[PDB]
Design an enzyme around this catalytic site. Sequence first.
Site, PDB file in Angstrom:
ATOM      1  N   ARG B 266       0.830  -1.200   0.000  1.00  0.00           N
ATOM      2  CA  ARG B 266       0.000   0.000   0.000  1.00  0.00           C
ATOM      3  C   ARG B 266       0.865   1.251   0.000  1.00  0.00           C
ATOM      4  O   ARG B 266       1.844   1.328   0.738  1.00  0.00           O
ATOM      5  CB  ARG B 266      -0.948  -0.016   1.217  1.00  0.00           C
ATOM      6  CG  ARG B 266      -2.012  -1.113   1.125  1.00  0.00           C
ATOM      7  CD  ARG B 266      -2.966  -1.115   2.306  1.00  0.00           C
ATOM      8  NE  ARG B 266      -3.780  -2.327   2.274  1.00  0.00           N
ATOM      9  CZ  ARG B 266      -4.945  -2.486   2.881  1.00  0.00           C
ATOM     10  NH1 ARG B 266      -5.478  -1.496   3.585  1.00  0.00           N
ATOM     11  NH2 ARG B 266      -5.600  -3.628   2.771  1.00  0.00           N
ATOM     12  N   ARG B 281       1.426   1.154  10.392  1.00  0.00           N
ATOM     13  CA  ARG B 281       1.143   1.588   9.017  1.00  0.00           C
ATOM     14  C   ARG B 281       2.373   1.487   8.087  1.00  0.00           C
ATOM     15  O   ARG B 281       3.012   2.490   7.809  1.00  0.00           O
ATOM     16  CB  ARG B 281       0.587   3.029   9.053  1.00  0.00           C
ATOM     17  CG  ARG B 281      -0.100   3.492   7.763  1.00  0.00           C
ATOM     18  CD  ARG B 281      -1.001   4.708   7.983  1.00  0.00           C
ATOM     19  NE  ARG B 281      -1.969   4.517   9.073  1.00  0.00           N
ATOM     20  CZ  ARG B 281      -3.098   3.814   8.983  1.00  0.00           C
ATOM     21  NH1 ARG B 281      -3.438   3.229   7.838  1.00  0.00           N
ATOM     22  NH2 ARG B 281      -3.895   3.689  10.037  1.00  0.00           N
ATOM     23  N   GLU B 353      -7.475  -0.645  15.216  1.00  0.00           N
ATOM     24  CA  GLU B 353      -8.000  -1.534  14.177  1.00  0.00           C
ATOM     25  C   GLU B 353      -6.956  -2.609  13.816  1.00  0.00           C
ATOM     26  O   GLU B 353      -5.780  -2.290  13.601  1.00  0.00           O
ATOM     27  CB  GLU B 353      -8.389  -0.708  12.937  1.00  0.00           C
ATOM     28  CG  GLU B 353      -9.073  -1.477  11.813  1.00  0.00           C
ATOM     29  CD  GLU B 353      -9.181  -0.706  10.507  1.00  0.00           C
ATOM     30  OE1 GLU B 353      -9.152   0.546  10.537  1.00  0.00           O
ATOM     31  OE2 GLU B 353      -9.294  -1.355   9.445  1.00  0.00           O
ATOM     32  N   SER B 356     -10.956  -5.751   9.461  1.00  0.00           N
ATOM     33  CA  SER B 356     -12.088  -5.099   8.830  1.00  0.00           C
ATOM     34  C   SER B 356     -12.834  -6.200   8.065  1.00  0.00           C
ATOM     35  O   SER B 356     -12.243  -6.840   7.183  1.00  0.00           O
ATOM     36  CB  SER B 356     -11.624  -3.975   7.915  1.00  0.00           C
ATOM     37  OG  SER B 356     -12.739  -3.205   7.497  1.00  0.00           O
ATOM     38  N   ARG B 395       0.170  -6.126  12.827  1.00  0.00           N
ATOM     39  CA  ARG B 395      -0.603  -5.474  13.901  1.00  0.00           C
ATOM     40  C   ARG B 395      -0.896  -6.450  15.036  1.00  0.00           C
ATOM     41  O   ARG B 395      -0.982  -6.018  16.179  1.00  0.00           O
ATOM     42  CB  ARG B 395      -1.886  -4.794  13.378  1.00  0.00           C
ATOM     43  CG  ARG B 395      -1.596  -3.536  12.592  1.00  0.00           C
ATOM     44  CD  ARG B 395      -2.853  -2.811  12.216  1.00  0.00           C
ATOM     45  NE  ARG B 395      -2.574  -1.727  11.279  1.00  0.00           N
ATOM     46  CZ  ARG B 395      -3.389  -0.706  11.039  1.00  0.00           C
ATOM     47  NH1 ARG B 395      -4.545  -0.605  11.684  1.00  0.00           N
ATOM     48  NH2 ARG B 395      -3.046   0.233  10.165  1.00  0.00           N
TER      49      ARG B 395
HETATM   50  N1  LIG Z   1      -0.757  -0.326   6.087  1.00  0.00           N
HETATM   51  C1  LIG Z   1      -1.680  -1.083   6.684  1.00  0.00           C
HETATM   52  C2  LIG Z   1      -3.057  -0.951   6.328  1.00  0.00           C
HETATM   53  C3  LIG Z   1      -3.933  -1.784   6.916  1.00  0.00           C
HETATM   54  N2  LIG Z   1      -3.520  -2.733   7.831  1.00  0.00           N
HETATM   55  C4  LIG Z   1      -4.490  -3.689   8.414  1.00  0.00           C
HETATM   56  O1  LIG Z   1      -5.153  -4.363   7.354  1.00  0.00           O
HETATM   57  C5  LIG Z   1      -6.512  -4.605   7.760  1.00  0.00           C
HETATM   58  C6  LIG Z   1      -7.379  -4.854   6.550  1.00  0.00           C
HETATM   59  O2  LIG Z   1      -7.265  -3.688   5.672  1.00  0.00           O
HETATM   60  S1  LIG Z   1      -8.583  -2.973   5.124  1.00  0.00           S
HETATM   61  O3  LIG Z   1      -8.130  -2.133   4.072  1.00  0.00           O
HETATM   62  O4  LIG Z   1      -9.298  -2.443   6.229  1.00  0.00           O
HETATM   63  N3  LIG Z   1      -9.518  -4.104   4.498  1.00  0.00           N
HETATM   64  C7  LIG Z   1      -9.082  -5.142   3.627  1.00  0.00           C
HETATM   65  O5  LIG Z   1      -7.963  -5.076   3.111  1.00  0.00           O
HETATM   66  C8  LIG Z   1     -10.060  -6.294   3.399  1.00  0.00           C
HETATM   67  N4  LIG Z   1      -9.543  -7.139   2.318  1.00  0.00           N
HETATM   68  C9  LIG Z   1     -10.162  -7.146   4.663  1.00  0.00           C
HETATM   69  O6  LIG Z   1      -8.872  -7.503   5.144  1.00  0.00           O
HETATM   70  C10 LIG Z   1      -6.878  -3.371   8.575  1.00  0.00           C
HETATM   71  O7  LIG Z   1      -7.969  -3.659   9.441  1.00  0.00           O
HETATM   72  C11 LIG Z   1      -5.575  -3.065   9.327  1.00  0.00           C
HETATM   73  O8  LIG Z   1      -5.595  -3.723  10.590  1.00  0.00           O
HETATM   74  C12 LIG Z   1      -2.164  -2.845   8.175  1.00  0.00           C
HETATM   75  O9  LIG Z   1      -1.816  -3.714   8.980  1.00  0.00           O
HETATM   76  N5  LIG Z   1      -1.268  -1.999   7.585  1.00  0.00           N
HETATM   77 CA   LIG Z   2     -12.016   0.573   7.575  1.00  0.00          CA
END
Ligand SMILES: Nc1ccn([C@@H]2O[C@H](COS(=O)(=O)NC(=O)[C@@H](N)CO)[C@@H](O)[C@H]2O)c(=O)n1
Ligand SMILES: [Ca+2]
Lengths: 428, 428
Positions: B266, B281, B353, B356, B395
């Site tokens: 991401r 993040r 969080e 999700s 996380r």
């Molecule tokens: N840079 C990041 C961004 C997000 N996350 C973690 O990914 C989870 C799912 O992402 S989502 O965007 O909320 N939904 C999804 O991707 C769905 N496919 C269900 O998984 C978040 O709840 C957060 O806990 C992280 O660890 N690091």
């Molecule tokens: Ca969300």
Amino acid sequence: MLDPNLLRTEPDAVAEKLARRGFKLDVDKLRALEERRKVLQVQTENLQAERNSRSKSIGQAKARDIEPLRLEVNKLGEQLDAAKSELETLLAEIRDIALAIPNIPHDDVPVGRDENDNVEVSRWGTPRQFDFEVRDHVTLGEMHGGLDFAAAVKLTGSRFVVMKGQLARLHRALAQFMLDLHTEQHGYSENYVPYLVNQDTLYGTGQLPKFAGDLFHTRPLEEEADSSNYALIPTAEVPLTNLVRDEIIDEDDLPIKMTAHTPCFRSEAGSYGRDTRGLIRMHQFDKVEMVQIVRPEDSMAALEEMTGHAEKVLQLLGLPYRKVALCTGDMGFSACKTYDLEVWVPAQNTYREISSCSNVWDFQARRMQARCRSKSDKKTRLVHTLNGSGLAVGRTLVALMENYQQADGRIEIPEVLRPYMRGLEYIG
Amino acid sequence: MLDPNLLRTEPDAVAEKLARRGFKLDVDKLRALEERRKVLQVQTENLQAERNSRSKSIGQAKARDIEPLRLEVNKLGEQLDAAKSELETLLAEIRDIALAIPNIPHDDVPVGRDENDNVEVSRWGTPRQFDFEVRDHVTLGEMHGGLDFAAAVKLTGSRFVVMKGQLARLHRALAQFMLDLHTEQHGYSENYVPYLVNQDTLYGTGQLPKFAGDLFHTRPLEEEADSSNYALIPTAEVPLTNLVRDEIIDEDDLPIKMTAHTPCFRSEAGSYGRDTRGLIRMHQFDKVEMVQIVRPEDSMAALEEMTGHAEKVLQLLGLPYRKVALCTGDMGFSACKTYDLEVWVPAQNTYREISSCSNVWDFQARRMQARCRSKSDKKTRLVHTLNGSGLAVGRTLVALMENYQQADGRIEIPEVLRPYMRGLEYIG
Ligand SMILES: Nc1ccn([C@@H]2O[C@H](COS(=O)(=O)NC(=O)[C@@H](N)CO)[C@@H](O)[C@H]2O)c(=O)n1
Ligand SMILES: [Ca+2]
Ligand SMILES: Nc1ccn([C@@H]2O[C@H](COS(=O)(=O)NC(=O)[C@@H](N)CO)[C@@H](O)[C@H]2O)c(=O)n1
Ligand SMILES: [Ca+2]
Ligand SMILES: [Ca+2]
Ligand SMILES: [Ca+2]
Ligand SMILES: [Ca+2]
Ligand SMILES: [Ca+2]
Ligand SMILES: [Cl-]
Ligand SMILES: [Cl-]
């Protein structure tokens, strides 16, 4: 990177050793650029000295009219920046040549032109004799519904796979077994690494400047415009070896033995018509990598040890293989000495490469400035680096499926993997 | 993608429901383009009919001078290609609007503007009271030498991590435990997927056309110039959900429950100053994803089941958490209904969080043309899709480290993970 002083004092002996790899070192071009570099270096350093001097003469007169002097320092600064820029362009040309030179092969390496000149060192296990027509891993994958190449073409494109169910579970069990073997029995420390790396990292392990076309590259991010020209890793060797970049290691802390399980991304350029069917040559494949950072006098013993660590995986899995010493013409760019392990592939009626174990000597250590020192020592020295597959996981799955297939297409689970599969004896 | 017939027959009721998400549907622009599209569609189809007719009149006269007729068919073909190209450009504009419309929120979803309007549904476990000053996971990682952010900046750049030794082993144990839980107890089938996907896949799950900036994109390969514009997956939801793209599934085969453990890439655009320190993040993170393909009447029950599957991970790990029902203004683009799980993070003195879980209804199924049918039925219908984190692994490691830390920095290993760590009780 070769020792710059070795290119200056023995260029013909260096050129001769590289000629065995089929590499022609352009000694004349390199000598002509270097003679010009010395002329520009003297001119530039003289300009640097005079500018520093006239700048000091301003500071003297300022505390003691600085207008005729300010004009002189400005003109000198114009000339210097121009001279420095000209010298920097010439240095970049010398580097383009120096950084494209492969490693000097070790005297242990047999001379040869290609893979047909490689030498078989040992052989382990007896290829199974089947009472039925041998099915390849692709046919077996379709029978189980576990290897889906068409779904991967739909999601992405060619040279990708989708694994489903018990065959995906088995692929995972293999990687788990490999990591546990190397960390619990072989003295390697486990690592989680980035799968995207920067240009410094790629220069460090030798992918840059010569093999950018072997890689997947990412476009820079909008909010990281000048610092996100990344490439996907072709092997965990790239991030793991670069962990010692710009470090001075206490010799008491050596050897540093690292392992990682990662996906590996390769463009597979020039592979037209080669391994078109199956898992053997994918753009994405999992691999359990072994990396060793050692003292210069221990690298040859470390290579034997690391090759034995990769051999142990095949032996415990009951997979027949042959160990091959690569010739000068078949070695990779960074390697000074390589052993390949080739596993029996029943459907192909041959041995196929599953591991490549190399002694890189001080080649990557020179690029990375990865050093070691004893507490007493007045100077440091470059470490040696080694890397070996233990093993390429997708290719291990191919060998397991084909070697352990039953008359009805069921796959027998190798005894060592049954604890990783809740004691399951067969898939299907 | 919303039902095109729902936009044609109830545009004001659709616009009203989307207004709750803070999305303003431009009904007037969409109606003006569609009225023009109908005029061009009639003009084009008339040209198509006359060209097909005059082409048939040539074949008649050829077997019965075809020069005055050939000139007519050539002119008609020129006019038709021009009309088709004009209509195709207008269709592309309508699609740019239609494909940028988020999912209609379900009536179960509370109305709100942002995350501060989200509703707490349940709470599990009691946040631990410490007899010492709470250390964050970053400080704990430095104490163990197991979380190295500076090495990741050297290898790559910011928002990456290098894990070393027992903490990397623990991160792996977490992902193994999650996969085993979902495959052995929750009825999910394991999958190995590509981590690079094509434009069709990204349109299929809703990343395209609106969120290209949320992704890492790869430059095309030289030998695959027109078929390798790929992006790294932001979640296993993207390749897993697209496995049913262009499929007609027998309703007896539903539900299709899939799980995968993958890295997730991401860009994290707009996160300036947010979660600057630590693993929360990153640009790259591991996640165990759950995806369900179900019958339209079973999606609401499937969401409850999948949320409970993600809750089970936290409960077995002994990690206190709260379950939150997201409001209209805080839901993701594809979701019609979402629950978030937020784990206790001792150093932050709040819940963060970690999962999700969404019901996407037929939104992605419409884009992908993912259908189901009973053997009797004269017509098919769109399936419903669901996705949920079970869980984001990095996380989970943050929550485990901080919640299980000892006075001296040692990390207690949760009881359920000890079989995945050879019975080890503590790290350090
Ligand atoms: N840079 C990041 C961004 C997000 N996350 C973690 O990914 C989870 C799912 O992402 S989502 O965007 O909320 N939904 C999804 O991707 C769905 N496919 C269900 O998984 C978040 O709840 C957060 O806990 C992280 O660890 N690091
Ligand atoms: Ca969300
Ligand atoms: N597309 C591909 C390309 C290669 N491989 C498998 O990777 C192994 C290591 O690759 S290497 O290029 O020979 N050396 C290295 O990468 C070193 N770091 C040591 O691992 C090969 O021996 C082959 O078995 C594959 O499975 N799929
Ligand atoms: Ca020691
Ligand atoms: Ca090789
Ligand atoms: Ca090498
Ligand atoms: Ca059924
Ligand atoms: Ca979603
Ligand atoms: Cl030099
Ligand atoms: Cl339509």
